[PDB]
């Protein structure tokens, strides 16, 4: 028994930003070997990087929040990070708590805040948090500490306590790992790869809620596998027999074959594509496992 969940891409959950999958494509123009830390799983069930089981952990974090007002900046939150199930975060062999963002830019986050001001007790406060690539904020989620702030003329009278932070929007998105440890290197899942000559990465794409003062173009973010596949492998714990799995992407109502591809053991899909521009595929198909294959198995082009 080695199979995939019978779920169309358009109905799947994205693995690096909590939103549906909207696109399926290959693009030789983009980095062929991204070092994404979320949405990384071995076919045998081993989660890699900061990949979580649940899509609700993706691009989120939990923490003990301590708030302090700073003239000239506003209300400042010092988040002491926890794993999103409440278990203690211990700096170890990964970049950050499971699900922490693995991209850069300025992130609007939202947390439950209790206030002491009269007439309101519970509200949701939007903070700004700089992720990367480089920052003067000295973010160190690897060490379990990050800083956010919200513009405030005076104290918001917030009560310190535990929080779960979820992303509201991205500002100046860059698909490059954030500042995990004040600019120092941390344990990272390796760059996705390798690929045979003529093979390129299959990309599951969604789009992120964006702040952009000039450009209305949507912000894309790709992942190697949808979150359904991540938990599917984590739960099944398959025995791996070869370097990759031969898959066929089909429309089951027609049976028409859209393309064949190789799902490497290490959790990415490669298509043989010699074109130069992006090639988008329909998202209403199903991935079908055919057999185990060796690394040098040559795919048919598309």
């Amino acid at each position: 028994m080695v199979d995939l969940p019978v779920i169309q891409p358009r109905l799947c959950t994205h693995a690096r930003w909590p939103a549906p999958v909207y696109g399926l494509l290959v693009d030789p123009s983009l980095p062929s070997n991204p070092q994404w830390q979320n949405g990384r799983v071995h076919v045998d069930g081993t989660l890699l990087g900061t990949t979580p089981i649940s899509g609700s952990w993706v691009s989120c974090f939990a923490a003990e929040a301590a708030y302090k007002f700073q003239s000239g900046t506003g209300e400042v939150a010092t988040f002491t990070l926890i794993e999103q199930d409440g278990s203690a975060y211990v700096p170890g062999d990964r970049a950050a708590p499971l699900g922490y963002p693995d991209f850069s830019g300025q992130l609007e986050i939202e947390v439950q805040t209790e206030t002491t001001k009269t007439g309101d007790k519970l509200k949701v406060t939007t903070f700004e948090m700089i992720l990367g690539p480089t920052t003067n904020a000295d973010q160190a989620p690897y060490q379990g500490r990050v800083f956010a702030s919200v513009t405030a003329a005076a104290s918001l009278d917030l009560v310190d306590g535990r929080v779960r932070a979820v992303p509201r929007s991205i500002y100046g998105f860059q698909d490059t790992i954030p500042e995990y440890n004040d600019g120092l290197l941390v344990p990272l899942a390796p760059p996705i790869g390798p690929f045979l000559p003529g093979e390129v990465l299959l990309r599951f794409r969604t789009y992120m809620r964006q702040i952009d003062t000039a450009d209305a173009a949507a912000e894309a973010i790709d992942c190697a596998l949808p979150q359904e596949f991540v938990s599917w492998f984590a739960s099944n714990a398959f025995t791996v027999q070869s370097e990759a799995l031969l898959l066929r992407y089909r429309n089951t109502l027609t049976g028409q074959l859209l393309f064949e591809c190789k799902l490497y053991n290490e959790g990415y899909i490669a298509l043989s594509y010699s074109g130069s521009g992006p090639l988008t595929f329909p998202t209403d198909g199903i991935f079908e496992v055919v057999s185990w294959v060796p690394r040098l198995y040559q795919l048919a082009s598309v």
Binding site: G72, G105, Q106, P133, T134, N136, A137, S149, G172
Partner: protein, 109 residues
């Protein structure tokens, strides 16, 4: 009360220069001061930074000098190009969130 304040907007014309005075409170005397460029705010491009002394620093078309008796560091930008218009920041280097003040730079031809 605010640790650092400066001009909200400043202007110069192409090939000219401009000066920016970043006033700060006395407790930040012995901290590095810097002049940053671009948004997002806290990932901006540092153009020049001091060594926490009054020594003037010059890098490309930008210079910074900290007057620690009056508690002001002065930034100059020379040979102004239209490409220099945008968002800049008076900065103070410290652990965690740096004290920063937004300065908008406008360029006329």
């Amino acid at each position: 009360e605010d640790p650092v304040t400066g001009p909200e907007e400043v202007s110069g014309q192409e090939q000219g220069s401009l000066t920016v005075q970043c006033r700060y409170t006395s407790g930040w005397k012995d901290y590095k001061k810097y002049w940053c460029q671009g948004v997002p705010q806290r990932s901006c491009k540092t153009l020049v930074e001091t060594d926490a002394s009054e020594q003037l620093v010059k890098k490309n078309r930008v210079s910074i000098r900290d007057n620690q008796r009056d508690f002001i560091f002065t930034v100059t930008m020379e040979d102004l190009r239209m490409s220099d218009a945008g968002i800049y920041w008076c900065g103070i280097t410290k652990g965690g969130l740096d004290p920063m003040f937004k300065v908008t730079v406008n360029i006329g031809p």
